[PDB]
């Protein structure tokens, strides 16, 4: 072990994150593609980066999925948090949903096309969410690119997901700040 | 908006301060105590990550027992609550640094000084990343050793004050 | 509170393939391994392989990769298939639910209800 | 594999007795993930310890589990008719395969 001025002997300590499983959100990281901000222990959300789609109009009927009500409303304060935060956002035409029966589906069409891309500013709030392992997804002034095509983003069940990054609430908590921040008028 | 949540946890100990992370809050580990001394600076410092750190789960300790639980989970709380438990630009900090290539804190891992006969223990600071790699020891060895110094000279400021 | 029931053909030639189905019930088909173990008299009791929803498949490597443990979450049900059967393969096979503990798997449990079993046979 | 060696294969008593029985780990199980089951005939298994000596649910103080590494020990004081069947160890720690012991057998001693 390490002494430094030889009676102080260096310790190390590692925050188990999980146990804030029933007050925040959680984010960690199963794989390069597969990403998940969990909620509790019965639900979450998964982020995907993907070449596959899984909606292929281009509506996002988020006044009658309130009207309707069926969804589960951590899971739309996520989501809308996520959204909220996308730099510059201006392609609504890129963003697909469905909400029927109260599921979450959302996808970005990351192909729309550097900086003025409407993928840069979905995979920079991708990057702050996924914040802990988020590095082995993708590879400029903070713009980023990606090969995959779309970012969906899907209700999923409580498993294991969390297979390569252990979970941490930082991410979430971060972006909480970005929200409605170089949004644009319409 | 600057942090306010004050740690409670000074039942059954030498003298009121400090806070104990227990074993469900610790990866694979013990309970780990740190004394007032230390703990005490997170009542003023705005850069010290495990600082904001103890608050959220002493928010998230509080808030399970003093709170029913819901039916399903909600975040309106935490989402209420977050600014008066961390500093939002703290982590900003890190992620600034990140986008730079400059080592940063992921809030995981922290070390501190042990001493090795009277057990006292330093503030624990984060160990920092960069790119998936942590760094190594020898990268801020010269952080610890004014560590080591800041100790002792605590510890001189309190034998003279116990008098 | 969950209840595993297995099903499928107990009655399989050699050199064919051996087909089992669980059947969860009152519970989610969610946070748990859904195992397969079967329980010779000669041999005792050996594990056949674990499928979770978060998309991890691990199997005995003593089956040679002749095993295959399907999911099917419409249906809430497991399913078991055994190709290039042999007479060894005769035994008592088991359904499973190994209860997941932690999104990181930090903590774990064993599999902890178990099917009431089909009886298998291999014989022309 | 970490193979599970249980000994004895049968051990004989009457009700009211205690029932010391071992199994022996090849390799250190891991984080003492360690388990038993009682099978009764016919009947599937049932846990009755994890974590090498936590007791299950509805398990009654009777059972207690106790070792770690590669020494493991169940022993059931007090014997009740109700108890004897054949007992098996489960690690479940390791990687592919978890494995199981070959059975101890708890028979009535008249």
């Known amino acids: 072990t390490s002494l430094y001025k030889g009676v102080y002997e260096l310790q190390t300590l590692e925050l188990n994150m999980e146990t804030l499983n029933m007050t925040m959100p959680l984010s960690c990281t199963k794989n390069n593609s597969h990403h998940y901000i969990m909620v509790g222990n019965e639900t979450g959300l998964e982020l995907t980066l993907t070449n596959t789609s899984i909606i292929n109009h281009k509506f996002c009927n988020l006044s009658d999925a309130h009207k309707k009500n069926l969804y589960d409303h951590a899971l739309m304060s996520i989501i809308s948090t996520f959204h909220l935060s996308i730099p510059n956002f201006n392609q609504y035409e890129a963003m697909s949903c469905d909400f029927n029966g109260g599921k979450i589906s959302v996808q970005y069409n990351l192909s729309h096309s550097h900086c003025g891309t409407v993928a840069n500013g979905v995979l920079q709030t991708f990057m702050r969410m996924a914040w802990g392992g988020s590095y082995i997804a993708l590879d400029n002034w903070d713009c980023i690119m990606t090969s995959y095509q779309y970012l969906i983003i899907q209700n999923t069940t409580w498993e294991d997901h969390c297979q390569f990054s252990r979970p941490s609430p930082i991410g979430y908590l971060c972006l909480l700040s970005q929200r409605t921040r170089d949004i644009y008028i319409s | 908006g600057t942090f306010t949540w004050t740690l409670s946890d000074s039942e059954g100990k030498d003298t009121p301060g400090g806070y104990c992370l227990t074993r469900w809050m610790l990866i694979e580990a013990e309970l780990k105590c740190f004394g007032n001394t230390a703990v005490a600076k997170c009542n003023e410092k705005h850069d010290e990550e495990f600082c904001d750190m103890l608050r959220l789960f002493d928010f998230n300790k509080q808030a399970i027992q003093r709170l029913k639980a819901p039916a399903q989970t909600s975040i309106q709380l935490i989402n209420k609550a977050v600014n008066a438990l961390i500093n939002d630009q703290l982590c900003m900090k890190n992620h600034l640094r990140d986008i730079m290539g400059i080592p940063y804190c992921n809030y995981s891992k922290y070390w501190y000084l042990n001493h090795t006969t009277t057990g006292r223990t330093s503030l624990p600071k984060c160990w920092l990343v960069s790119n998936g790699s942590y760094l190594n020891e020898t990268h801020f060895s010269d952080d610890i050793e004014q560590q080591a110094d800041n100790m002792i000279t605590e510890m001189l400021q309190k034998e003279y004050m116990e008098r | 509170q969950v209840q595993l029931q297995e099903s499928g053909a107990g009655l399989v030639k050699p050199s064919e393939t051996l087909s089992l189905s669980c059947a969860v019930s009152?519970?989610?088909?969610?946070?748990?391994?859904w195992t397969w173990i079967r329980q010779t008299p000669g041999k005792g009791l050996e594990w056949i392989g674990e499928?979770?929803?978060?998309?991890?498949?691990n199997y005995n490597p003593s089956l040679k990769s002749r095993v295959t443990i399907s999911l099917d979450t419409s249906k809430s049900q497991f399913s078991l298939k055994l190709t290039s059967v042999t007479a060894a393969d005769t035994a008592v096979y088991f359904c499973?639910?190994?209860?997941?503990?932690?999104?990181?798997?930090?903590?774990?449990?064993?599999?902890?209800?178990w099917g009431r079993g089909t009886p298998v046979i291999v014989s022309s | 594999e970490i193979v599970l060696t249980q000994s004895p294969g049968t051990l004989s008593l009457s009700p009211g007795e205690r029932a010391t029985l071992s199994c022996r780990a090849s390799?250190?199980?891991?984080?003492?993930?360690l388990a038993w089951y009682q099978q009764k005939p016919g009947q599937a298994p049932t846990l009755v310890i994890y974590?090498?000596?936590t007791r299950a649910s509805g398990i009654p103080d009777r059972f207690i589990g106790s070792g770690s590494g590669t020494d493991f020990t169940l022993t059931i004081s007090r014997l009740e008719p109700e108890d004897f069947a054949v007992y098996y160890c489960?690690?479940?720690?390791?990687?592919?395969?978890?494995?199981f012991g070959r059975g101890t057998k708890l028979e009535i001693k008249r």
């Open positions: 499928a979770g929803r978060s998309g991890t498949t």
């Open positions: 499973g639910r190994r209860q997941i503990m932690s999104l990181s798997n930090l903590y774990k449990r064993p599999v902890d209800s």
């Open positions: 974590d090498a000596s």
């Open positions: 009152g519970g989610p088909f969610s946070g748990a391994y």
């Open positions: 390799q250190s199980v891991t984080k003492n993930y």
């Open positions: 489960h690690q479940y720690g390791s990687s592919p395969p978890y494995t």
